[PDB]
Amino acid sequence: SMSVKKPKRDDSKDLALCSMILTEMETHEDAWPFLLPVNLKLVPGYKKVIKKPMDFSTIREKLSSGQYPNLETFALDVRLVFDNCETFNEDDSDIGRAGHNMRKYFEKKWTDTFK
């Protein structure tokens, strides 16, 4: 509350560390469904159904331009990429499996770097 604070966690490396995680997600072999924005002119149903599209290149641009206020807003966008994928793709599809695999990969890196 006012003039009552928990001890200050060092957040000075968060930006660099989120960038490293994001590099590792970009270079994973199952990243291909997620590298670029879904083409809303060429994919029927996407625009109407997925209210907040997100992809790795869009996260990279937001990261690089100071549009994440803290490491939690960064994790929310990464998770959004996988939640969108699950909303639109069957579990038993290459893209559906890709999304489960990447979400796992991400969550481990996240816990190991920050928890």
Helix axes 71-88, 94-114, angle to 10 degrees: 160
Q: Residue ranges of the alpha helices (H) in the chain?
A: 14-26, 46-49, 56-64, 71-88, 94-114
Pick the CATH number of 1-115 from 1.10.10.60, 3.40.50.800, 3.90.550.10, 1.20.920.10: 1.20.920.10
First-to-final CA distance of the chain: 24
| Contact assessment for residue 71 and residue 59, using Cβ atoms and an 8 Å cutoff | no
Helix axes 71-88, 14-26, angle to 10 degrees: 20
Domain range list for the chain: 1-115
For residue 29, report the phi and psi dihedrals to the nearest 5 degrees: -65, -25
| Contact assessment for residue 34 and residue 56, using Cβ atoms and an 8 Å cutoff | yes
Structure tokens of 22?
Answer: 């994001």
d(C-alpha 96, C-alpha 86), whole Å:
6
| Contact assessment for residue 26 and residue 35, using Cβ atoms and an 8 Å cutoff | yes
d(C-alpha 87, C-alpha 39), whole Å:
16
For residue 15, report the phi and psi dihedrals to the nearest 5 degrees: -55, -50
The resolution in Å comes to 1.7
